[model samples]
Target: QYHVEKFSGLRIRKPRVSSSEMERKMNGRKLIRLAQLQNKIATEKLEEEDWVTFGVIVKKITPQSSNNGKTFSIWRLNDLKDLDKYISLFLFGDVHKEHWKTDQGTVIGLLNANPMKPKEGTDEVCLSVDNPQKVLLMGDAVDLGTCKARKKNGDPCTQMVNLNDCEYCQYHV
Candidate 1:
């Protein structure tokens, strides 16, 4: 409910599907660097309603339990070209403990990441994910593929099953 109130209010004209697709969509477009994004926001040059997309590698995940009963975590992300620079991404969702067990070192394609101002006692600006589905987990393997399970309506499940030779996703299994 809280997430709905906070994130769902912002309506995106085009919904993001995956990282590769987003990268392709923004190809020859107005894509900017991580630091440039921060700078644009800092200078008030980028509007709050504007959308931005980028690709990054997962450096680490820091989990925090919240008072509102939802899982709040920070994903340390680094640009593919720059290893020294990293950004703190705030993710507020119903995240399971095992959601990121095999996620480190993987590439994530992020689209429409919401930039939040510095919180109390903090000077660094953080990015947030309004919709978890906007994040695409691209592992080291090129062809991780989707689950083989069929949904109730006979449509195939599109969840990424990165581990093992399982024919279905965790939920499908």
Candidate 2:
């Protein structure tokens, strides 16, 4: 007679597989560093709509105070090859408020990153992902920077725009 052990977090009964099997499956997938992903994007000439999977180091995380008085979080990632490129991952509304701590430095595995460039910016590009299930962020999960800092000289304001907000709200304003 086989009896089932009910675990608190287990959503399924009659577990047909062991934990090791799940671990093996996860480990079998490809792993890429931030720098490597950047190089591939550059070398492959990936377009803005192209999807890519890769990891990136959280070089800097900053919070922006929108003109409308909403605060949003953005992450700057450096790709694998050390080539200089900036990808702003936007965290908006509750997502921004809840994961405010995510602004701290960390490495995040981007499952489906789509390249986007601001219509009126220079040397500024972004990779957008929303509520990604497979995205993995490594390092301490906490916000560790001041938000009152001003944008440096020559910093493009468009770079600070949240894509979601722009598309839904500000674009028409």
Candidate 3:
């Protein structure tokens, strides 16, 4: 049931924005296309210390799985910009099947997301998120979680840092 050629809502078309454009437009909160994200990770530009937010179109939702009493699920996804490549998202902890299931074309937002590098031969980008609250569904309430310092532009710094110690991220600290 997970594998299929196409979903009912699938709309095949060219991407509106290019990979480089996506990176340029990223304001720390906006979604970055998978291709650009992968390139950054592959070149060692991004590490575990860095955090990101992205949106991916769900291709398939695998059945609920468990390991060592920990619940998890693997959801096949694709960056809407690059339909040729596949992106994997591993959602752990309290993964509700009903809540995750959605129309194949629906855009799932991952806030404060973490990116994992691909395997040796196959370069498949993987995303990891353990908290369900960080996964945003269609039209869910948006909670801006980032640095508290306001910039000259009157916008909060979009940096991920230890919020417990200071209101500003490392750059402002």
For model 2, residues 8-121, the per-residue Cα lDDT tens digits are 111222333455644443454444444455565556545433233432335545555775868766676643223244566665555555555753344344555655545565
What's the lDDT for candidate 3?
A: 0.50
lDDT of each: 0.53, 0.44, 0.50
User: For every candidate structure, what is the RMSD over all alpha carbons to the true structure, in angstroms?
Assistant: 14.9, 15.8, 18.9
Using lDDT, give the best candidate's number.
Answer: 1
Which digits, one per residue and each the tens of the lDDT, describe model 1 over residues 73-166? Answer: 6776654333334677776663333334535555555556777866788656578765756565544432234678887697888765533345
Clashes of 1: 0
Reference-based TM-score of each model: 0.55, 0.43, 0.50
Off by over 4 Å in 1: 1-24, 27-29, 48-51, 94-102, 120-123, 141-173
Ranking by lDDT: 1, 3, 2
Q: Tally clashing residue pairs in candidate 2.
A: 7
For candidate 2, the lDDT comes to 0.44
After TM-score superposition, what is the CA distance of residue 77 in candidate 3 from its true location, in Å? Answer: 1.8
